[PDB]
Amino acid sequence: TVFEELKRYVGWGDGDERALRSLHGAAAPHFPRLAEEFYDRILGHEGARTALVGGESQVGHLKVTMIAWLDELLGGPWDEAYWDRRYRIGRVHVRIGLPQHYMFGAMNVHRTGLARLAYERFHGDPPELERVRNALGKVLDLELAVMLHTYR
Amino acid sequence: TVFEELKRYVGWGDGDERALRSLHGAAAPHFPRLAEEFYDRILGHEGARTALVGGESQVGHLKVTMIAWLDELLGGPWDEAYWDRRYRIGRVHVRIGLPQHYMFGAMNVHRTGLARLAYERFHGDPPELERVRNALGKVLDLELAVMLHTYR
Ligand code: HEM
Ligand code: HEM
Ligand SMILES: [C-]#N
Ligand SMILES: [C-]#N
Ligand SMILES: [Cl-]
Protein backbone atom coordinates (compact mmCIF):
# COMPACT_ATOMS: atom_id res chain seq x y z
CA THR A 1 0.00 0.00 0.00
CA VAL A 2 3.11 2.35 -0.41
CA PHE A 3 1.85 5.17 -2.66
CA GLU A 4 -1.56 5.02 -0.86
CA GLU A 5 0.05 5.22 2.62
CA LEU A 6 2.36 8.09 1.57
CA LYS A 7 -0.32 10.15 -0.22
CA ARG A 8 -2.09 10.20 3.15
CA TYR A 9 1.12 10.99 5.07
CA VAL A 10 1.99 13.99 2.90
CA GLY A 11 -1.57 15.26 2.51
CA TRP A 12 -1.88 14.58 -1.27
CA GLY A 13 -5.08 16.15 -2.62
CA ASP A 14 -6.82 17.60 -5.67
CA GLY A 15 -4.99 20.88 -4.86
CA ASP A 16 -1.58 19.26 -5.49
CA GLU A 17 -2.87 17.69 -8.69
CA ARG A 18 -4.00 21.12 -10.04
CA ALA A 19 -0.68 22.69 -9.07
CA LEU A 20 1.37 20.03 -10.90
CA ARG A 21 -0.82 20.39 -14.02
CA SER A 22 -0.24 24.18 -13.89
CA LEU A 23 3.51 23.46 -13.60
CA HIS A 24 3.33 21.07 -16.61
CA GLY A 25 2.21 24.05 -18.70
CA ALA A 26 5.24 26.12 -17.70
CA ALA A 27 7.82 23.25 -17.67
CA ALA A 28 7.10 21.08 -20.75
CA PRO A 29 8.68 23.39 -23.35
CA HIS A 30 11.83 22.99 -21.18
CA PHE A 31 11.72 19.17 -20.81
CA PRO A 32 14.44 18.72 -23.47
CA ARG A 33 16.74 21.08 -21.50
CA LEU A 34 15.96 19.37 -18.14
CA ALA A 35 16.79 15.97 -19.79
CA GLU A 36 19.96 17.61 -21.15
CA GLU A 37 21.05 18.83 -17.65
CA PHE A 38 20.18 15.37 -16.23
CA TYR A 39 22.44 13.37 -18.64
CA ASP A 40 25.14 16.08 -18.53
CA ARG A 41 25.45 15.51 -14.75
CA ILE A 42 25.62 11.69 -15.13
CA LEU A 43 28.23 11.99 -17.97
CA GLY A 44 30.26 14.50 -15.89
CA HIS A 45 30.57 12.18 -12.86
CA GLU A 46 33.21 9.48 -12.58
CA GLY A 47 31.10 6.84 -10.87
CA ALA A 48 27.74 7.49 -12.54
CA ARG A 49 29.10 7.67 -16.14
CA THR A 50 30.12 3.98 -15.88
CA ALA A 51 26.39 3.05 -15.96
CA LEU A 52 26.02 4.51 -19.48
CA VAL A 53 27.90 2.27 -21.90
CA GLY A 54 25.59 2.09 -24.94
CA GLY A 55 27.20 5.16 -26.58
CA GLU A 56 25.99 8.14 -28.64
CA SER A 57 22.65 6.62 -29.44
CA GLN A 58 21.87 5.55 -25.85
CA VAL A 59 21.76 9.06 -24.41
CA GLY A 60 19.53 10.11 -27.29
CA HIS A 61 17.07 7.27 -26.52
CA LEU A 62 17.14 7.92 -22.73
CA LYS A 63 16.41 11.65 -23.35
CA VAL A 64 13.25 10.53 -25.22
CA THR A 65 12.07 8.33 -22.32
CA MET A 66 13.09 10.98 -19.70
CA ILE A 67 10.96 13.57 -21.60
CA ALA A 68 7.99 11.12 -21.34
CA TRP A 69 8.82 10.52 -17.65
CA LEU A 70 8.63 14.23 -16.95
CA ASP A 71 5.47 14.64 -18.95
CA GLU A 72 3.73 11.94 -16.87
CA LEU A 73 5.25 13.31 -13.60
CA LEU A 74 3.57 16.69 -14.05
CA GLY A 75 0.45 15.69 -16.05
CA GLY A 76 -0.72 12.55 -14.27
CA PRO A 77 -3.03 11.10 -13.22
CA TRP A 78 -1.29 9.73 -10.14
CA ASP A 79 -3.47 6.63 -9.62
CA GLU A 80 -2.47 2.99 -9.08
CA ALA A 81 -1.66 2.43 -12.75
CA TYR A 82 0.85 5.35 -12.67
CA TRP A 83 2.58 4.13 -9.48
CA ASP A 84 2.75 0.51 -10.73
CA ARG A 85 4.57 1.91 -13.82
CA ARG A 86 6.97 3.78 -11.48
CA TYR A 87 7.64 0.47 -9.67
CA ARG A 88 8.70 -1.19 -12.94
CA ILE A 89 10.96 1.81 -13.67
CA GLY A 90 12.62 1.27 -10.27
CA ARG A 91 13.19 -2.41 -10.99
CA VAL A 92 14.91 -1.55 -14.33
CA HIS A 93 17.68 0.28 -12.35
CA VAL A 94 17.81 -2.52 -9.81
CA ARG A 95 18.39 -5.09 -12.60
CA ILE A 96 21.20 -3.09 -14.29
CA GLY A 97 22.86 -3.09 -10.84
CA LEU A 98 22.89 0.73 -10.53
CA PRO A 99 23.87 1.70 -6.97
CA GLN A 100 20.75 3.05 -5.22
CA HIS A 101 22.46 6.16 -3.94
CA TYR A 102 22.67 7.47 -7.56
CA MET A 103 18.85 7.69 -7.66
CA PHE A 104 18.96 10.49 -5.01
CA GLY A 105 21.67 12.38 -6.90
CA ALA A 106 19.80 12.10 -10.21
CA MET A 107 16.42 13.14 -8.64
CA ASN A 108 18.18 16.14 -7.07
CA VAL A 109 19.07 17.44 -10.59
CA HIS A 110 15.40 17.32 -11.64
CA ARG A 111 14.36 18.79 -8.23
CA THR A 112 16.70 21.78 -8.69
CA GLY A 113 15.70 22.54 -12.34
CA LEU A 114 11.96 22.05 -11.67
CA ALA A 115 12.07 24.25 -8.52
CA ARG A 116 13.77 26.94 -10.66
CA LEU A 117 11.09 26.78 -13.45
CA ALA A 118 8.35 26.96 -10.80
CA TYR A 119 9.86 30.07 -9.18
CA GLU A 120 10.32 31.73 -12.57
CA ARG A 121 6.69 31.22 -13.59
CA PHE A 122 4.90 31.65 -10.27
CA HIS A 123 6.96 34.21 -8.27
CA GLY A 124 4.42 36.96 -9.06
CA ASP A 125 1.64 35.04 -7.36
CA PRO A 126 3.27 33.85 -4.09
CA PRO A 127 0.32 31.70 -2.92
CA GLU A 128 0.32 29.78 -6.18
CA LEU A 129 4.13 29.41 -6.04
CA GLU A 130 3.63 27.88 -2.57
CA ARG A 131 1.01 25.40 -3.83
CA VAL A 132 3.23 24.45 -6.81
CA ARG A 133 6.47 24.21 -4.77
CA ASN A 134 4.62 22.02 -2.22
CA ALA A 135 3.17 19.64 -4.84
CA LEU A 136 6.53 19.31 -6.61
CA GLY A 137 8.24 18.32 -3.38
CA LYS A 138 5.55 15.72 -2.68
CA VAL A 139 5.60 14.06 -6.11
CA LEU A 140 9.42 13.85 -6.15
CA ASP A 141 9.60 12.42 -2.60
CA LEU A 142 6.95 9.78 -3.46
CA GLU A 143 8.89 8.83 -6.69
CA LEU A 144 11.98 8.30 -4.56
CA ALA A 145 9.91 6.29 -2.05
CA VAL A 146 8.47 4.04 -4.77
CA MET A 147 11.78 3.56 -6.63
CA LEU A 148 13.65 2.74 -3.41
CA HIS A 149 10.94 0.22 -2.43
CA THR A 150 12.08 -1.77 -5.52
CA TYR A 151 15.64 -1.99 -4.14
CA ARG A 152 14.14 -4.00 -1.18
CA THR B 1 31.20 6.88 0.88
CA VAL B 2 27.52 7.67 -0.01
CA PHE B 3 27.97 11.22 1.27
CA GLU B 4 31.27 11.74 -0.75
CA GLU B 5 30.24 10.26 -4.20
CA LEU B 6 26.86 11.91 -3.92
CA LYS B 7 28.25 15.28 -2.79
CA ARG B 8 30.14 15.54 -6.11
CA TYR B 9 27.04 14.45 -8.06
CA VAL B 10 24.80 17.24 -6.65
CA GLY B 11 27.58 19.85 -6.77
CA TRP B 12 27.79 20.27 -2.95
CA GLY B 13 30.21 23.08 -2.10
CA ASP B 14 31.23 25.80 0.31
CA GLY B 15 28.40 27.96 -1.14
CA ASP B 16 25.73 25.42 -0.06
CA GLU B 17 27.24 25.48 3.46
CA ARG B 18 27.02 29.34 3.52
CA ALA B 19 23.44 29.39 2.26
CA LEU B 20 22.22 26.91 4.89
CA ARG B 21 24.02 28.83 7.72
CA SER B 22 22.31 31.98 6.52
CA LEU B 23 18.90 30.24 6.72
CA HIS B 24 19.67 28.83 10.22
CA GLY B 25 19.39 32.25 11.81
CA ALA B 26 15.99 32.85 10.22
CA ALA B 27 14.56 29.35 10.74
CA ALA B 28 15.74 28.41 14.27
CA PRO B 29 12.99 30.33 16.08
CA HIS B 30 10.45 28.16 14.13
CA PHE B 31 12.05 24.78 14.89
CA PRO B 32 9.55 24.17 17.72
CA ARG B 33 6.66 24.70 15.25
CA LEU B 34 8.31 22.41 12.68
CA ALA B 35 8.77 19.74 15.35
CA GLU B 36 5.09 20.08 16.32
CA GLU B 37 4.03 19.75 12.67
CA PHE B 38 6.26 16.63 12.31
CA TYR B 39 4.79 14.82 15.33
CA ASP B 40 1.18 15.80 14.55
CA ARG B 41 1.61 14.17 11.13
CA ILE B 42 2.88 10.92 12.67
CA LEU B 43 -0.01 10.84 15.23
CA GLY B 44 -2.62 11.50 12.55
CA HIS B 45 -1.35 8.74 10.24
CA GLU B 46 -2.96 5.32 10.69
CA GLY B 47 0.23 3.22 10.17
CA ALA B 48 2.93 5.57 11.47
CA ARG B 49 1.13 6.55 14.71
CA THR B 50 1.68 3.03 16.19
CA ALA B 51 5.41 3.75 16.53
CA LEU B 52 4.59 6.34 19.29
CA VAL B 53 3.26 4.29 22.20
CA GLY B 54 5.78 5.47 24.87
CA GLY B 55 3.66 8.36 26.12
CA GLU B 56 3.85 12.11 26.43
CA SER B 57 7.51 11.87 27.62
CA GLN B 58 8.54 9.86 24.53
CA VAL B 59 7.04 12.62 22.29
CA GLY B 60 8.59 15.37 24.45
CA HIS B 61 12.06 13.83 24.23
CA LEU B 62 11.74 13.23 20.45
CA LYS B 63 10.89 16.94 20.00
CA VAL B 64 14.18 17.90 21.74
CA THR B 65 16.27 15.61 19.57
CA MET B 66 14.37 16.84 16.45
CA ILE B 67 15.15 20.49 17.25
CA ALA B 68 18.84 19.40 17.67
CA TRP B 69 18.49 17.46 14.35
CA LEU B 70 17.31 20.64 12.58
CA ASP B 71 19.98 22.85 14.19
CA GLU B 72 22.68 20.53 12.85
CA LEU B 73 20.92 20.34 9.41
CA LEU B 74 21.15 24.06 8.81
CA GLY B 75 24.02 25.01 11.16
CA GLY B 76 26.53 22.32 10.32
CA PRO B 77 29.25 21.54 9.82
CA TRP B 78 28.58 18.80 7.30
CA ASP B 79 31.76 16.77 7.94
CA GLU B 80 32.59 13.06 8.45
CA ALA B 81 31.33 13.23 12.07
CA TYR B 82 27.99 14.72 10.98
CA TRP B 83 27.43 12.03 8.36
CA ASP B 84 28.46 9.25 10.81
CA ARG B 85 25.82 10.63 13.29
CA ARG B 86 23.26 10.47 10.38
CA TYR B 87 24.12 6.78 9.69
CA ARG B 88 23.55 5.98 13.37
CA ILE B 89 20.16 7.80 13.31
CA GLY B 90 19.18 5.84 10.22
CA ARG B 91 20.08 2.61 12.09
CA VAL B 92 17.79 3.49 15.07
CA HIS B 93 14.82 3.33 12.69
CA VAL B 94 15.87 0.04 11.09
CA ARG B 95 16.34 -1.34 14.68
CA ILE B 96 12.79 -0.40 15.80
CA GLY B 97 11.30 -1.86 12.59
CA LEU B 98 9.91 1.30 11.05
CA PRO B 99 8.89 0.72 7.40
CA GLN B 100 11.45 2.56 5.27
CA HIS B 101 8.80 4.45 3.25
CA TYR B 102 7.82 6.47 6.27
CA MET B 103 11.20 8.19 6.17
CA PHE B 104 10.13 9.81 2.89
CA GLY B 105 6.75 10.91 4.27
CA ALA B 106 8.39 12.39 7.40
CA MET B 107 11.17 14.16 5.39
CA ASN B 108 8.55 15.73 3.13
CA VAL B 109 6.97 17.41 6.20
CA HIS B 110 10.27 19.13 6.99
CA ARG B 111 11.00 19.86 3.33
CA THR B 112 7.65 21.64 3.00
CA GLY B 113 8.05 23.72 6.21
CA LEU B 114 11.73 24.59 5.51
CA ALA B 115 10.96 25.59 1.91
CA ARG B 116 8.30 28.00 3.22
CA LEU B 117 10.77 29.47 5.76
CA ALA B 118 13.44 29.95 3.01
CA TYR B 119 10.91 31.72 0.83
CA GLU B 120 9.74 33.92 3.73
CA ARG B 121 13.33 34.98 4.59
CA PHE B 122 14.80 35.27 1.09
CA HIS B 123 12.06 36.23 -1.40
CA GLY B 124 13.19 39.90 -1.57
CA ASP B 125 16.57 38.63 -2.98
CA PRO B 126 15.82 36.07 -5.74
CA PRO B 127 19.46 35.02 -6.36
CA GLU B 128 19.99 34.26 -2.64
CA LEU B 129 16.67 32.40 -2.41
CA GLU B 130 17.93 30.36 -5.37
CA ARG B 131 21.13 29.37 -3.48
CA VAL B 132 19.31 28.62 -0.24
CA ARG B 133 16.53 26.59 -1.96
CA ASN B 134 19.11 24.63 -3.93
CA ALA B 135 21.19 23.93 -0.79
CA LEU B 136 18.05 22.88 1.16
CA GLY B 137 17.05 20.41 -1.62
CA LYS B 138 20.55 18.95 -1.64
CA VAL B 139 20.90 18.50 2.09
CA LEU B 140 17.49 16.78 2.43
CA ASP B 141 18.20 14.55 -0.55
CA LEU B 142 21.58 13.56 0.93
CA GLU B 143 19.96 12.87 4.30
CA LEU B 144 17.46 10.54 2.62
CA ALA B 145 20.32 8.84 0.72
CA VAL B 146 22.23 8.13 3.98
CA MET B 147 19.08 7.05 5.84
CA LEU B 148 18.14 4.62 3.13
CA HIS B 149 21.69 3.27 2.87
CA THR B 150 21.06 1.98 6.44
CA TYR B 151 17.95 0.06 5.47
CA ARG B 152 20.07 -2.19 3.15
C1 HEM C 1 15.37 10.37 -11.16
C2 HEM C 1 16.10 9.30 -11.49
C3 HEM C 1 15.84 8.44 -12.65
C4 HEM C 1 14.72 8.31 -13.41
C5 HEM C 1 13.38 9.02 -13.20
C6 HEM C 1 15.03 7.41 -14.46
C7 HEM C 1 14.11 7.00 -15.42
C8 HEM C 1 14.35 5.99 -16.34
C9 HEM C 1 13.38 5.50 -17.26
C10 HEM C 1 11.98 6.05 -17.39
C11 HEM C 1 13.95 4.46 -17.95
C12 HEM C 1 13.33 3.64 -19.06
C13 HEM C 1 12.85 2.28 -18.55
C14 HEM C 1 11.97 1.72 -19.65
O1 HEM C 1 12.49 1.26 -20.70
O2 HEM C 1 10.72 1.76 -19.53
C15 HEM C 1 15.28 4.30 -17.47
C16 HEM C 1 16.22 3.40 -17.96
C17 HEM C 1 17.59 3.54 -17.69
N1 HEM C 1 18.18 4.41 -16.84
FE1 HEM C 1 17.29 5.62 -15.65
N2 HEM C 1 16.33 6.96 -14.34
C18 HEM C 1 16.89 7.56 -13.28
C19 HEM C 1 18.23 7.44 -12.84
C20 HEM C 1 19.25 6.80 -13.57
C21 HEM C 1 20.65 6.90 -13.32
C22 HEM C 1 21.27 7.69 -12.18
C23 HEM C 1 21.30 6.17 -14.29
C24 HEM C 1 22.76 6.00 -14.48
C25 HEM C 1 23.70 6.75 -13.92
C26 HEM C 1 20.31 5.63 -15.15
C27 HEM C 1 20.55 4.81 -16.23
C28 HEM C 1 19.52 4.18 -16.94
C29 HEM C 1 19.81 3.13 -17.93
C30 HEM C 1 21.14 2.59 -18.40
C31 HEM C 1 18.61 2.73 -18.41
C32 HEM C 1 18.42 1.67 -19.47
C33 HEM C 1 18.41 0.27 -18.85
C34 HEM C 1 18.30 -0.83 -19.91
O3 HEM C 1 17.39 -0.77 -20.75
O4 HEM C 1 19.08 -1.83 -19.96
N3 HEM C 1 19.08 6.07 -14.71
N4 HEM C 1 15.51 5.28 -16.51
C1 HEM D 1 12.93 12.70 8.38
C2 HEM D 1 12.63 11.66 9.16
C3 HEM D 1 13.18 11.42 10.52
C4 HEM D 1 14.24 11.98 11.22
C5 HEM D 1 15.23 13.04 10.75
C6 HEM D 1 14.26 11.39 12.52
C7 HEM D 1 15.22 11.69 13.51
C8 HEM D 1 15.34 10.97 14.67
C9 HEM D 1 16.35 11.16 15.63
C10 HEM D 1 17.45 12.21 15.60
C11 HEM D 1 16.18 10.23 16.59
C12 HEM D 1 17.01 10.11 17.85
C13 HEM D 1 17.94 8.92 17.90
C14 HEM D 1 18.64 8.96 19.24
O1 HEM D 1 17.98 9.17 20.31
O2 HEM D 1 19.90 8.84 19.28
C15 HEM D 1 15.03 9.48 16.27
C16 HEM D 1 14.49 8.47 17.04
C17 HEM D 1 13.21 7.96 16.81
N1 HEM D 1 12.38 8.22 15.77
FE1 HEM D 1 12.80 9.29 14.25
N2 HEM D 1 13.26 10.48 12.60
C18 HEM D 1 12.55 10.46 11.45
C19 HEM D 1 11.43 9.68 11.17
C20 HEM D 1 10.68 8.91 12.07
C21 HEM D 1 9.39 8.37 11.85
C22 HEM D 1 8.62 8.46 10.55
C23 HEM D 1 8.98 7.74 13.00
C24 HEM D 1 7.73 7.00 13.35
C25 HEM D 1 6.59 6.90 12.68
C26 HEM D 1 10.06 7.94 13.95
C27 HEM D 1 10.10 7.45 15.23
C28 HEM D 1 11.24 7.53 16.02
C29 HEM D 1 11.34 6.79 17.29
C30 HEM D 1 10.26 5.95 17.92
C31 HEM D 1 12.56 7.04 17.79
C32 HEM D 1 13.10 6.55 19.12
C33 HEM D 1 13.43 5.07 19.12
C34 HEM D 1 13.96 4.68 20.48
O3 HEM D 1 13.21 4.72 21.48
O4 HEM D 1 15.17 4.35 20.62
N3 HEM D 1 11.02 8.70 13.36
N4 HEM D 1 14.50 9.96 15.08
C1 LIG E 1 17.63 7.31 -16.83
N1 LIG E 1 17.67 7.76 -18.03
C1 LIG F 1 11.81 10.74 15.26
N1 LIG F 1 11.56 11.76 16.01
CL1 LIG G 1 10.71 29.13 -4.00
Side-chain angles (χ1 to χ4, degrees), chain A residues 5-6 8-9 41-42 45 100-102 105-106 108 111-112 116 119 126 133-134 137-138 141 148 152, chain B residues 5-6 9 41-42 45 100-102 105-106 108 111-112 119 126 130 134 137-138 141 148 151-152:
Chain A
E5 273 199 298
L6 289 191
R8 282 191 268 112
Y9 202 111
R41 199 74 62 78
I42 291 174
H45 181 274
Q100 75 182 38
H101 73 279
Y102 294 120
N108 189 264
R111 187 184 308 275
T112 304
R116 196 202 136 77
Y119 176 87
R133 190 170 73 227
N134 290 354
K138 293 175 200 191
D141 289 343
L148 267 291
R152 311 289 171 264
Chain B
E5 277 212 77
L6 221 43
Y9 201 115
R41 206 73 65 87
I42 291 162
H45 187 264
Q100 75 172 44
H101 60 280
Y102 295 153
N108 188 258
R111 178 191 309 279
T112 304
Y119 177 93
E130 179 169 48
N134 292 358
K138 292 180 207 197
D141 285 346
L148 273 99
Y151 272 99
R152 299 174 353 92

Side-chain angles (χ1 to χ4, degrees), chain A residues 38 42 48-49 51-52 58 62 65-66 69 89 92-93 96 98 102-103 106-107 110 147, chain B residues 9:
Chain A
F38 184 94
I42 291 174
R49 174 170 53 209
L52 296 180
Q58 170 183 52
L62 295 176
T65 46
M66 189 56 67
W69 188 91
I89 286 160
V92 173
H93 299 83
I96 66 178
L98 179 69
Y102 294 120
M103 304 308 274
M107 196 66 78
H110 284 329
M147 270 176 340
Chain B
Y9 201 115

Side-chain angles (χ1 to χ4, degrees), chain A residues 115-116 118-119 123 129-130 133, chain B residues 115-116 118-119 123 129-130 133:
Chain A
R116 196 202 136 77
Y119 176 87
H123 72 264
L129 174 55
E130 182 170 50
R133 190 170 73 227
Chain B
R116 183 193 37 94
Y119 177 93
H123 73 273
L129 171 57
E130 179 169 48
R133 178 182 70 239

